[PDB]
């Protein structure tokens, strides 16, 4: 299962609180538990946009999780609906990546944003 240090990085994601409670919600049948909580984060940050795992995450207003590569592409195409929902965004939307999520997810999944 996961560890203590992996637990307080999570509850370091405060904008993601629901999700993650979502996720540690989900003992397996086959190979091992800490195998099942990967594949469960996985799922739960893929960006709708490019369908890889999230990799600078914007956490939108409508809690959604997209790429901020992917939304920039977005914003300059003149959408400023959020892919996952089609909420509106706006113009100017003030963004910051989410470094709590990219923190876990980097810790989890060390090299995944390589090149990215
Ligand atoms: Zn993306
Ligand atoms: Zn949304």
């Given at each position: 299962s996961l560890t203590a240090q992996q637990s307080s990085l999570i509850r370091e994601d405060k904008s993601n609180a629901?999700?993650?409670?979502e996720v540690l919600a989900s003992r397996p049948a086959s190979?091992?538990?800490?195998?099942?909580?990967?594949?469960?984060v996985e799922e739960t940050f893929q960006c709708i946009c490019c369908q890889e795992l999230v990799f600078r995450p914007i956490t939108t207003v409508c809690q959604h999780n997209?790429?901020?590569?992917?939304?920039?592409r977005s914003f300059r195409a003149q959408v400023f609906s959020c892919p996952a929902c089609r909420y509106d965004l706006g113009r100017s939307y003030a963004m910051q990546?989410?470094?709590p999520l990219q923190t876990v997810l980097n810790?989890?999944?060390?090299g995944?944003?390589?090149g990215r």
């Open positions: 629901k999700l993650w409670n190979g091992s538990p800490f195998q099942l909580f990967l594949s469960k997209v790429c901020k590569d992917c939304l920039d990546v989410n470094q810790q989890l999944f060390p995944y944003g390589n």
